[PDB]
């Protein structure tokens, strides 16, 4: 854990992953393993397969490496990019809304719609089943209004959604 967090410490951002305090990670891993005397390979695999807070930089990195040469059949509603190269971000409480990665991280705030709503992240080009499922999710959300849950501050919004390759 210490050797791993050394890399964010070099770049001065280890505080986001919880800082140099590796003990809470040990506490969580033992809580998963019901305080087992020893930890094996499979248990560690399952423990990290659920986005551990301190380790998010391993998968995301590879995920970025998996989305540097991906071309989607869509457009960016803000900068009128066509087609989006790289990541793709789809809205859920709106229809026909998509934004590129740069338009998302930088914050091109077009008047009328904010960016503090749930999103969906796509690395690989999508398929028809994903599109129709997104349509169904949008329709279901359209009748689940009145702000059941809201998150205005950022505080760290890294685990957006899992694509399961």
């Amino acid at each position: 854990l210490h050797d791993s967090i050394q890399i964010p410490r070099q770049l001065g951002e280890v505080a986001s992953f919880g800082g140099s305090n590796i003990e809470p990670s040990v506490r969580s891993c033992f809580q998963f393993a019901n305080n087992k005397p020893e930890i094996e390979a499979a248990l560690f695999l399952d423990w990290m397969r659920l986005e551990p807070q301190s380790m998010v930089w391993l998968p995301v990195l590879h995920r970025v490496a998996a989305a540097e040469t991906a071309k989607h059949q869509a457009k960016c509603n803000i900068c009128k990019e066509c087609p989006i190269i790289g990541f793709r971000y789809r809205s859920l409480k709106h229809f026909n809304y998509d934004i590129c990665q740069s338009c998302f991280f930088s914050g091109r705030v077009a008047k009328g719609h904010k960016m503090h709503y749930p999103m969906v992240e796509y690395c690989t080009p999508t398929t028809s089943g994903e599109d129709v499922r997104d349509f169904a999710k949008v329709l279901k959300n359209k009748f689940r209004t009145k702000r059941y849950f809201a998150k205005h501050p950022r505080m760290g919004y890294l685990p957006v959604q899992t694509v399961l390759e």
Binding site: Q73, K75, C82
Partner: protein, 53 residues
């Protein structure tokens, strides 16, 4: 333009239009064959403003 779902809707629309047009052409040919059509009238039954013949 015409990137994604717009293309897969336009293609289906064109196919539907082509099928409808083919059916309409068949109906027109059927009409032209049931009535022995000539520029003057149906078969030998000449038709003018005053009446039949």
């Amino acid at each position: 333009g015409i990137y994604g779902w717009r293309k897969r809707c336009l293609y289906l629309f064109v196919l539907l239009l082509l099928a409808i047009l083919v059916v309409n052409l068949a109906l027109t040919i059927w009409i032209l064959k049931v009535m022995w059509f000539s520029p003057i009238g149906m078969g030998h039954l000449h038709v003018t403003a005053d009446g039949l013949r």
